[PDB]
Scaffold this active site. Sequence first.
Site, PDB file in Angstrom:
ATOM      1  N   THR C   1      -2.227  -7.302  -5.048  1.00  0.00           N
ATOM      2  CA  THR C   1      -0.941  -6.609  -4.759  1.00  0.00           C
ATOM      3  C   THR C   1      -0.821  -6.332  -3.258  1.00  0.00           C
ATOM      4  OG1 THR C   1      -0.671  -5.596  -6.919  1.00  0.00           O
ATOM      5  CG2 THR C   1       0.321  -4.431  -5.059  1.00  0.00           C
ATOM      6  N   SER C   2       0.396  -6.453  -2.716  1.00  0.00           N
ATOM      7  CA  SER C   2       0.785  -6.026  -1.344  1.00  0.00           C
ATOM      8  C   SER C   2       2.068  -5.189  -1.421  1.00  0.00           C
ATOM      9  CB  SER C   2       0.969  -7.205  -0.424  1.00  0.00           C
ATOM     10  OG  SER C   2      -0.101  -8.125  -0.553  1.00  0.00           O
TER      11      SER C   2
END
Lengths: 243, 231, 196, 204, 244, 5, 221, 250, 241, 195
Positions: C1-2
């Site tokens: 995830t970002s």
Amino acid sequence: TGYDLSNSVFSPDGRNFQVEYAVKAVENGTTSIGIKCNDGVVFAVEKLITSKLLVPQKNVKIQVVDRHIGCVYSGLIPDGRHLVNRGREEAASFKKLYKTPIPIPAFADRLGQYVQAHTLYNSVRPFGVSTIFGGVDKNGAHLYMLEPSGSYWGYKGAATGKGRQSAKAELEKLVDHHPEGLSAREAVKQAAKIIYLAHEDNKEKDFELEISWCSLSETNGLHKFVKGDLLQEAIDFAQKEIN
Amino acid sequence: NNYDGDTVTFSPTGRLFQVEYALEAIKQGSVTVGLRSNTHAVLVALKRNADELSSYQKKIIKCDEHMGLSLAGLAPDARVLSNYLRQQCNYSSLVFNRKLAVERAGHLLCDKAQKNTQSYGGRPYGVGLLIIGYDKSGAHLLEFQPSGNVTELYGTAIGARSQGAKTYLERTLDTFIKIDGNPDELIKAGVEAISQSLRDESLTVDNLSIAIVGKDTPFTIYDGEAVAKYI
Amino acid sequence: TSIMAVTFKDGVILGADSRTTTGAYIANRVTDKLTRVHDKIWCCRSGSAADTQAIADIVQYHLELYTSQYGTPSTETAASVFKELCYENKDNLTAGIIVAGYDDKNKGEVYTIPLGGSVHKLPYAIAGSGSTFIYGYCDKNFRENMSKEETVDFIKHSLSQAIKWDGSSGGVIRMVVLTAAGVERLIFYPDEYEQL
Amino acid sequence: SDPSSINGGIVVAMTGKDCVAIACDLRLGSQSLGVSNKFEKIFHYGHVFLGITGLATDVTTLNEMFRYKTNLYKLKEERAIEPETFTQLVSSSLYERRFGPYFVGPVVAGINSKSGKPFIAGFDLIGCIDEAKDFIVSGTASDQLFGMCESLYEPNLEPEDLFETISQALLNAADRDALSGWGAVVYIIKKDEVVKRYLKMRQD
Amino acid sequence: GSRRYDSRTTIFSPEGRLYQVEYALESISHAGTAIGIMASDGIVLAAERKVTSTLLEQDTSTEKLYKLNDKIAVAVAGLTADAEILINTARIHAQNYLKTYNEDIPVEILVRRLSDIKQGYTQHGGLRPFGVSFIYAGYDDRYGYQLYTSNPSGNYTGWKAISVGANTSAAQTLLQMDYKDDMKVDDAIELALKTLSKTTDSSALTYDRLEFATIRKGANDGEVYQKIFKPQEIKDILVKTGIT
Amino acid sequence: XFLXX
Amino acid sequence: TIVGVKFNNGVVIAADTRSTQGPIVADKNCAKLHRISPKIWCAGAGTAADTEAVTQLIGSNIELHSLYTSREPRVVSALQMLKQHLFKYQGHIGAYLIVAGVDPTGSHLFSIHAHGSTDVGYYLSLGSGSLAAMAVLESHWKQDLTKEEAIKLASDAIQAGIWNDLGSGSNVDVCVMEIGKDAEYLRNYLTPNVREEKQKSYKFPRGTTAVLKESIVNICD
Amino acid sequence: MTDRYSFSLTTFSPSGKLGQIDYALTAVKQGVTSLGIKATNGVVIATEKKSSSPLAMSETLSKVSLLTPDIGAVYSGMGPDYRVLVDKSRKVAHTSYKRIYGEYPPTKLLVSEVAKIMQEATQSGGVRPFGVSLLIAGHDEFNGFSLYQVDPSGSYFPWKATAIGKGSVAAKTFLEKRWNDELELEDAIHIALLTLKESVEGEFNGDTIELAIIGDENPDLLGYTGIPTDKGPRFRKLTSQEINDRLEAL
Amino acid sequence: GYDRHITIFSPEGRLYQVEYAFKATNQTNINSLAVRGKDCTVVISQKKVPDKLLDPTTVSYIFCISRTIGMVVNGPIPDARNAALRAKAEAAEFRYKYGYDMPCDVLAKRMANLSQIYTQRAYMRPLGVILTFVSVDEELGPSIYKTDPAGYYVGYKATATGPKQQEITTNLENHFKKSKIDHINEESWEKVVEFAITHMIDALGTEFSKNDLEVGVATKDKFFTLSAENIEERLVAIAEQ
Amino acid sequence: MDIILGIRVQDSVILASSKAVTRGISVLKDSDDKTRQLSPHTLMSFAGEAGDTVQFAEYIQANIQLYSIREDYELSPQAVSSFVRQELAKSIRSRRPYQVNVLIGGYDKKKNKPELYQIDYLGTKVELPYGAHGYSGFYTFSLLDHHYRPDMTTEEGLDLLKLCVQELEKRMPMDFKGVIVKIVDKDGIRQVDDF
Ligand SMILES: [Cl-]
Ligand SMILES: [Cl-]
Ligand SMILES: [Mg+2]
Ligand SMILES: [Mg+2]
Ligand SMILES: [Mg+2]
Ligand SMILES: [Mg+2]
């Protein structure tokens, strides 16, 4: 009949006689008032000096809730203390979850729901106190008065106890004569006068004056007791007005 | 009449008759006197016996090294409330390494007595207490009533014919308050105060009970030959 | 995830990728990691999808009940409710949440809540596996009181690099703009952001 | 210490033309040690037949439990439970112990008294229903039974022919498993008669 | 508090009687009469339905006679709703015993446990007692054929022939008159009906106002059969004895 | 066992 | 192998019919398509008992909710009740569901995982053969599918699983949920795995099996 | 605080009467007339929709309720008490049967579960009995069509036809004359409307009358196709139009 | 006669405590009115502030339960607030559990079921309030559902509550006899509020200032109360026609 | 605890139980009776975990004796065995299960038949002509399969039992200090003093 013997029983009128009987205990109590001002509230109370043996300034009746709310009551002292102890738990759990200190309208309902809950069952007694309370939050100043039934409203001025009608009459004049508003320091002086005028209805025993106040400017939005020079200044103002 | 069946019922004039009947139990109780100066606080208690063959009912209980009370009314109820004070004084010491304030002691007793006056099934406490103590704000004297009402005083008295001693202290207020750094003279004033509540009977060696706490004095009780000095 | 939240002149902007993975398999390539807990309080979800979904749903319930009684809650109040759940259940949760809301008084505010359940109020926050690769870039490029277009470019360029290096990040770049004007949703497709 | 393969045993059920057959071995052991050669694994509640393989203590417990529940059912409903209904009751009861299950492989067999339709069903230890037209298998030689049934079985067998098929399926399967065998029992179930036959098989 | 409204169901009268148990028995005395007669080769249960309506469904109805297990049945007198609570408990208790010991429950053990439940409601709990009197007709391999009765007090006693509900005084006199120890089931059937026919508050005793059941060893070789009589079967047995 | 597409 | 596909006027879910215990096929033609409500259908992978139990329980509570509220049940209600149940058990209830249906709000397609995480999509695939299925969906899916196109895509995605995944096999079950119409459950929509005629009949001569005892069993009272 | 009423509010009087049950039956007597008739191929349950106000929408208030697809219920007495019994009746049908046997309970057993709930309100601590009498019409495979009455006591009786509430005495007498064992469902609906007109005073139409049947299976009302064994609910509520059609040929 | 003190049946099959809770409803001496438009549901209530010391902004018998649902109460304020807080908690929980906003009629039934329990259970007294719930339901459209201490509830085309409820009711009945429809055939909620106030003036026979009235309006996806100036603007429009 | 045997013959049940109680490398006792009389015509021998064995045996004994007093009636060996099995069937899914294996030898006075039940700690009940618990079975079962006949007398049963003890004394690793033998028949329970 026998409708008045048990709490939470409706009379044929649709009345809870046990709550109306709790109001009689409040009417018997000493006079306490609340004055809403420009940027806060002022609380004052009549302390009957029963004897010379009472230590002056060392039987405090006004109680703080959190750091921003002041509470005063007339009637059964213990009942009032029980309600404030609950108020402090309600205010603590609100701040714990929501971070922000409890708003006054939010706090007012927490007491309201608690006192109302004591009119639902025959296994509990209604509260024998009318509580005048309030303070300063994000939305500004709020003054409330809560009754044994659990009924509360917002007030410009509030009065309860044996000299409520004398105090109410004096409060109504301030609201009429100051439509734009009353200042915090003025409200303290007025509070003193109204207690002294309301003392005419309890004039066998001489009394001791006790004042507290929350103000955004004067007390930085926190609840503080009026002591020393500011208290004696308010007493002298009240002494001059009765004569 | 119809509103004295239990503590949960209000009378039409807004009175709690069970609380008033509990108050009546104190008036039947033996006289006890409390008074303090700025340095010391003194309890004087007239102990009561069943007959000449019986012992004299102990009126004074120690709560901590710096606090204790005298009782008038139901002695078992005093034992419950004194035991509660001992625990609260003790909780303050263990958790906060702090001697419990005499004012907080009063507030805790008030709240404990109150809960018994608002709930069905329970009953009010049938005893009055005079709490003395020396804390960080000097000497203190409290009067506890089982209605929940606690009052801080210079001097007072509770029990039968307590009005005699209470009138004397009201006259002597200016004198005894300034008995600083003199234990024996403050006791003498207390013994002379309780003497105004005596009828037909006088203070004997196994009848009188005195307790004192102060600046450099832990809460200690004097009974038997130790009170012979003050007769 | 970002994921990240950036505060600017007119309010705050929330940015996230759209990749949910099981091992090295992409379960969902069009995920919405930006979720509404109130009208103008949104949050960015990282960690266990199941845990973050559960927390978000409870917070939304709490702030809905708060609104019914005491009116609109503050962004700080929302962050406090998130913290309370994350901190008290730290042993059973894998949730890295960024809380971002717009008040009229307080303007744009960003609070980050790591695994521990600690609260940190910041001018901007980055989180998720892909955030590691853009600490250097975001620190050098972030400025306070940016414009809407500048902040959108800052988030787009940042998440573009995060996505490029992090295998656990990819798909579309979703963004949610919180200002006095209202709530605006933005989407940016690979063909645009990849060749930045 | 695998509960399902301590005691050992097998159950197989087949359908025929207007009939069902259920069969089981008689072995109860403690791993290698053969203890009992009389331990029957098929029970019946009215016209509904239940065969249970797995941990023997749970086989006995569940028999006693389903006798309990079918007896109360009959008193309140004022009729015998049907195979389709009983199958649901077994499934309910097993899943009730989802995170502390009975280590069993139950098999329901019987003819619906109203419709006259042959019915068989199998379950896992947590009560998942496995309904089948042809056959159900259960026990320590389930692999063997699957292989035998899948090859030997054909649809619409007469009760006399069906007996030969299910018997040969059980016997040859039991002979390739160490923990199964020691005698077998076959129930041939028609609409309103039930024949119970004990098979001669190798006692090793 | 709530003390004001408490009836105090579980207390003694000055005379040493349980008010609620006595008033529960007064209730039961108005219920339709139920008779149990124990013969050497079976038991008869006969019960009179409470003033029937012509539009009542008679064949698919159960008011008086209930089955506890394959070997034990009960005739009810009092509140039917109260009886069904106790019957479902008795049915479960029977199955618990069978599950534990792999043997059908002895009649007395079932009766005692059901009677012990009734006793409980008279001593503690502050609830009203069950307004029900049972006639237990059952068989076991220890005592054979057995009749019992239990009442709201939780006291039970064994009988050769007994009546519960309405007109028990008149009914018990008629049974005591015509009953003998060497009696057969077929004779006991006739006695049961003849007793109801005379003690009934109705004009004439008919098939539609009766529930009837027998517990014989009339099955094939050393096994007990429960027969709950159908409407047509009661109509036939009523003609066969010459009542209609 | 336990049956588990 | 289970998948869900959205088309213009509704949603379609399909599933294979293979049930396995270890490497053995227990049921050749089981039903993985469950009816939560008349117009909400669910497809389940994972522990067979768990998928059947959890779909029945929520289906029961949805029916009581529908009767209480005097309203047709919503897919989001089934989704919320399933995910909160699964989350509470921290993945120990091994139910992987594709929840689809039509309600007064419109047509919906969701997936639920054992741990209680939910996903939204136009095409979804769960189970061991999800990668084989998702490969087909990713290759052939487009926006604005018709009813007949969506059934073809859904069944093709299941077939990919049947052939390529050892976990999946046998037949293709389909359920079409169109707006304003009754949901049509197409049990064994395709049967491309029919067993070929056996080379030999294994019908034994009567008396082949050796018997020790015979006895009539008493089923009557 | 806490419920201190752990003692029975219903007790036996010296005469042997359970006062609160008798007074609950008095409340049912005051209640609006409802009836049930059993035909050979179905059951009909009907009642008058007594409107509290002409502004009130009588469609929103449903006196006739579906318990299961094959079981329906109507009442006389206190509406609120009925509403919460329907809620409890629907749930107990699932919890204590359908979640165990994977099929809906037969009429007699669901009636038995409702009777149990109403019996407990008669004996349990700090509660009054339910002030309603229920008529429960239902079908099941092994018992066929059936009609049951349930009283505040928890007592239930099976009926060929009956009426409860205001004009029950006159309504029952009317049904005795008209009822036979050869009645078709349409003949039972016709008699139900005739019987109900006697008790109803004001307007008599499909908007003031609530009537439902337990008849043939309704595949159109099922909501899905594909399972042959599932053929739809036998419970159907007659529409305002369907009633008015039968009131012309009356 | 302890059958008049707790919620048990009297010999004539009545609950006197429930009947006395209904008389507590009119203790405030306030009349409320609810009507439905095409797109909206409008509720209006009398606002009486007798004490001069009272803060008139805090004197309210209308409550915002959820975003979509509004509730006006006829009865004492303690019981009114008791009912409000519960309804808010019930509406919030419903949304969390079932994933969609609680409908007006479903909340009305839930609060009615709670009211029913108090009429059957002895230790709980009935609340001396009549709760009128209003919303624009996404399925049923404009909705009015009212609850009473008996535990009764029903949907309404329009309704009125308070001491002079009957005068308002017949006034509305006579309008719907004339219009031949179930609602106020009006586009904007502003004119539906003007209708509500006009017909209350005709029925009660009193004129209203901006501080004499309290107005709640339900539209699609939000319920909101009107300020004094919003009502004043509305009163001007009535006077100029 | 180690060796407990049981042989049902024509008219009686015979239980043989080892006398050795060993803890570590010390035989603490060589005269231990590993049996309790549940009723006048029912005997239960037990073997397994230390403490659990006696605690379980006496608990069952108390329950059967309570029943006997309550009903003034002796429970059948079948009924007692079913009760014992259910207690062990409960036990195995407890926090701490009873690790006790039992043989129940009883004479049914109604049937006039001897009955031997073997129940392990899991609650696994079987009626047998001859039974054993622990490693004993691995020798005695094959021996009894050969020598046992169903119509044997009590004296023939004791000789058959001597043949088992001799085989165990020869091939068993541990010294179990011989056995206490008890006979259950129509006349109740009695102990053979010289074995
Ligand atoms: Cl996600
Ligand atoms: Cl509810
Ligand atoms: Mg990438
Ligand atoms: Mg073998
Ligand atoms: Mg071998
Ligand atoms: Mg009540």
